[PDB]
Amino acid sequence: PTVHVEVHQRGSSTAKKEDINLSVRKLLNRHNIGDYTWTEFDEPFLTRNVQSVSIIDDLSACTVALHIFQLNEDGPSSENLEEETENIIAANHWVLPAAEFHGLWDSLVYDVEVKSHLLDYVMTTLLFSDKNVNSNLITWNRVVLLHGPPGTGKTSLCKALAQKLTIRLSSRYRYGQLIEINSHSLFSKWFSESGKLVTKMFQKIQDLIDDKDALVFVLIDQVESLTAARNACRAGTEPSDAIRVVNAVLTQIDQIKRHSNVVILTTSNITEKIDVAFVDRADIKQYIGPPSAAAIFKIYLSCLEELMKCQIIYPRQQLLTLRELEMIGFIENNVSKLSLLLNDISRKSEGLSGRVLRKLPFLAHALYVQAPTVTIEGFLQALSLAVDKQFEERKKLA
Amino acid sequence: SQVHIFWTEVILHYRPCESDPTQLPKIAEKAIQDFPTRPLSRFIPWFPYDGSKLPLRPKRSPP
Amino acid sequence: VADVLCEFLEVAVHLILYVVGIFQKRKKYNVPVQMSCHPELNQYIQDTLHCVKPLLEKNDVEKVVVVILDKEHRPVEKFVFEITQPVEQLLRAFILKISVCDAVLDHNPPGCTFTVLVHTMQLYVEE
Amino acid sequence: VADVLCEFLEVAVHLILYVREVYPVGIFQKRKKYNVPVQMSCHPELNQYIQDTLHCVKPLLEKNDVEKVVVVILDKEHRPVEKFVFEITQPSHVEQLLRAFILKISVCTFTVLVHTREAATRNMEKIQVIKDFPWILADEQDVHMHDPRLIPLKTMTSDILKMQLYVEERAH
Ligand SMILES: Nc1ncnc2c1ncn2[C@@H]1O[C@H](COP(=O)(O)OP(=O)(O)OP(O)(O)=S)[C@@H](O)[C@H]1O
Numbered sequence A: 001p002t003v004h005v006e007v008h009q010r011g012s013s014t015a016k017k018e019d020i021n022l023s024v025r026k027l028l029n030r031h032n033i034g035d036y037t038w039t040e041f042d043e044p045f046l047t048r049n050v051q052s053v054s055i056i057d058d059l060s061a062c063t064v065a066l067h068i069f070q071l072n073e074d075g076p077s078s079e080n081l082e083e084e085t086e087n088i089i090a091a092n093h094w095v096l097p098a099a100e101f102h103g104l105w106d107s108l109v110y111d112v113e114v115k116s117h118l119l120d121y122v123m124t125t126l127l128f129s130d131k132n133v134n135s136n137l138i139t140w141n142r143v144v145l146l147h148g149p150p151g152t153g154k155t156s157l158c159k160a161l162a163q164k165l166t167i168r169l170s171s172r173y174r175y176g177q178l179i180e181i182n183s184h185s186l187f188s189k190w191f192s193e194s195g196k197l198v199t200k201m202f203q204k205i206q207d208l209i210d211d212k213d214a215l216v217f218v219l220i221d222q223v224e225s226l227t228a229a230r231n232a233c234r235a236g237t238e239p240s241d242a243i244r245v246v247n248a249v250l251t252q253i254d255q256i257k258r259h260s261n262v263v264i265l266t267t268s269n270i271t272e273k274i275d276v277a278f279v280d281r282a283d284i285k286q287y288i289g290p291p292s293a294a295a296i297f298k299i300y301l302s303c304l305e306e307l308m309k310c311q312i313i314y315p316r317q318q319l320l321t322l323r324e325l326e327m328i329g330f331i332e333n334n335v336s337k338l339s340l341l342l343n344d345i346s347r348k349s350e351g352l353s354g355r356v357l358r359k360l361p362f363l364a365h366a367l368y369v370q371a372p373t374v375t376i377e378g379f380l381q382a383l384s385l386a387v388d389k390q391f392e393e394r395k396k397l398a
Numbered sequence B: 001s002q003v004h005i006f007w008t009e010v011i012l013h014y015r016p017c018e019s020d021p022t023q024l025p026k027i028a029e030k031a032i033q034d035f036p037t038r039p040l041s042r043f044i045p046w047f048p049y050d051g052s053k054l055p056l057r058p059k060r061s062p063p
Numbered sequence C: 001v002a003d004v005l006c007e008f009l010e011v012a013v014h015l016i017l018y019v020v021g022i023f024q025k026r027k028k029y030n031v032p033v034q035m036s037c038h039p040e041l042n043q044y045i046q047d048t049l050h051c052v053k054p055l056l057e058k059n060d061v062e063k064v065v066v067v068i069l070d071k072e073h074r075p076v077e078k079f080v081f082e083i084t085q086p087v088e089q090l091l092r093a094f095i096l097k098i099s100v101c102d103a104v105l106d107h108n109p110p111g112c113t114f115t116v117l118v119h120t121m122q123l124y125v126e127e
Numbered sequence D: 001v002a003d004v005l006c007e008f009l010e011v012a013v014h015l016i017l018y019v020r021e022v023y024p025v026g027i028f029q030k031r032k033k034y035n036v037p038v039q040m041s042c043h044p045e046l047n048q049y050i051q052d053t054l055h056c057v058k059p060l061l062e063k064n065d066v067e068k069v070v071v072v073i074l075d076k077e078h079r080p081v082e083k084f085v086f087e088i089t090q091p092s093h094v095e096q097l098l099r100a101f102i103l104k105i106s107v108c109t110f111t112v113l114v115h116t117r118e119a120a121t122r123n124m125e126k127i128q129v130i131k132d133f134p135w136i137l138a139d140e141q142d143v144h145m146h147d148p149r150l151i152p153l154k155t156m157t158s159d160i161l162k163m164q165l166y167v168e169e170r171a172h
Helices: A017-031 A044-049 A114-130 A156-168 A194-209 A252-256 A293-309 A322-328 A337-348 A354-364 A379-396 B025-032 C002-018 C039-057 C089-104 D002-019 D044-063 D094-106 D121-127
Strands: A003-008 A052-056 A064-069 A077-079 A091-096 A143-147 A176-181 A215-221 A262-268 A284-287 B003-005 B056-058 C023-028 C031-036 C115-119 D029-033 D036-040 D066-073 D082-089 D110-116 D135-137 D154-157 D162-169
Touching (some): A003 A017, A017 A044, A017 A064, A064 A156, A114 A156, A156 A176, A156 A215, A156 A262, A176 A194, A194 A215, A194 A252, A252 A262, A293 A322, A293 A337, A293 A354, A337 A379, A354 A379, B025 C115, C002 C031, C002 C039, C002 C089, C031 D094, C039 C115, C089 D094, C089 D154, D002 D036, D002 D044, D002 D066, D002 D082, D036 D094, D044 D066, D044 D110, D044 D121, D094 D154, D094 D162, D121 D135
Parallel strands (some): A143 A262, A143 A284, A215 A262
Antiparallel strands (some): A003 A052, A077 A091, A091 A176, B056 D135, C023 C031, D066 D082, D082 D162, D154 D162
């Protein structure tokens, strides 16, 4: 077997890597007790040179591997044209691991096991790379598609992937680059100038790829915009946008397929209206669906123990997870009532997009309760009314 | 007035052969500063010599 | 005298790296001291003091701060040597002051990974 | 530290008869101990004399009735020149500071002068029960180190052992 451990090193901490590894291994072997995360330490060095330690899926086993990472402080660099520096490309450039991305991989909650599939995909990619397999004989396009309902966190999973991969695979690539492509600023449309513009940003991608000691992730938002369905569209009125801008990207991406330290990640909204010659050039086209009842309950939990962690809900009552309610078998009791009422909200708040789910506490603490400090079961009631407030508001805008 | 970091207008020192420590200059800053010293304790033996008491001497000598 | 003071700073820096089996007794300045045989370290400390040498040719100097680092390079200990720079017992008296200092106090992990500093015979330790 | 201190006094007494040449250099040899090259001896009479010394000195080490146990360089007429005082408050980290004392002895007849608050009578009778050699109370001329240089050679406030050693010696 194997288990993974990740430890936040402070930027103002500068001790050597192997000392950090030895110290964390010492803490683990002394403690050696589930998936909980350490925050409390007992060594002045380790305190001033560590922020937290965490286990990612209660056992005293010693099959432990350490990944140590530094979330880079500064945000995005910008990419503009070479001689038309005003606005032509304007691509976003994250130098991973990055600060604004942490905690993101944990918060997201799905029910189709996208995380494991879409992570061990890259793991098997590296395995086949190091074993020297005949790239002429077994190959992959290094393109992963994610499509589904709007606001359901489709694109969130790609930044989480990139963060988790530049963290997990440290000391195998010093760092990673993540290029966020704006598929709306590359449509300067007068007689195939956009189809010529894709070329420049892809040469810059080549520039960031040849640095063979950096793992690069190219994240394309709205991959339906760049690749419009040319065949079924019975519109000859499309002069050269539907034929000389999709064909200007189906080549530059078949050109980076030969390299190995690149991965293409794409986010789509419309399943149709996309070129059939691009739904073959993607290894994984995984569908991100709207949250389901258990998922909704887990997200609502995350929110509520987040509020309790910041003391918003001052009287701390144990919120019982759905597994404990199944174990007891749905028995009403003086503490078990709150979880039950949460679960009734979960069925009643079914079918909403994850973004409004992660908003709903904001509104429920906005209009219905002005209290700077709130007791539970009134805040819960505020949620149970704010959800119906959201249904009626959606019905209001027709 | 000047401090050197053999790793105020500061004259650091680099010795390019050693250059594993990816971030050097911030390491160099730490080495310079002062920080709270503990007092140099004026020391005292705890069990002093009382002249009214006489110690023990065995007879034998080395060959 | 600056040259022989720099050789005594050699004696200091490295014997205090001692004050384990990779170290050995040998005759330095007519006393036996248990240092290291490392020729790379020998010439490296010689280089430290001989780059300190033009520094003392300037004659403007305050301390020779032989910082005994921890393994973190973030001082949990230190050894400031504030000699107010303008027979064998006294050339050994300095070594006995530092030994009694590390006596009442304590050392650091085996590899002290120390980085000599200078601020341009007496001493103390910021622990 | 009973074994540790015992072997330390062995290596000590050889360094003591070595460094100031009261005996010829060729008599003692060397081996390896405490990660330190140390000076040893194998001459029989001295070996057994020191043997009796150590297995007679261990119980003062355990019971702690001793303000300070001393090793004294003596002349052929019992004329002390250097006392080595163990001012000891005995109530993983200890042996390394004994490396430090080894260095210190390198840069610091004979007798085992045990300063106890009680009379040496119990210790004396004990010497003649773990040795044929009789122990006597130290006379006037074997204790007086006139003009003592009160320099503390090396102190250790270890949680296991409050130990401070120094040479009570004249101006020299
Ligand atoms: N399924 C989910 N589970 C938990 N949190 C979610 C989920 N989906 C979305 N979120 C939260 O939604 C916020 C942003 O989601 P987005 O990824 O921007 O949605 P999106 O899918 O990008 O929609 P598009 O395609 O860009 S309109 C993040 O803060 C996520 O935490």
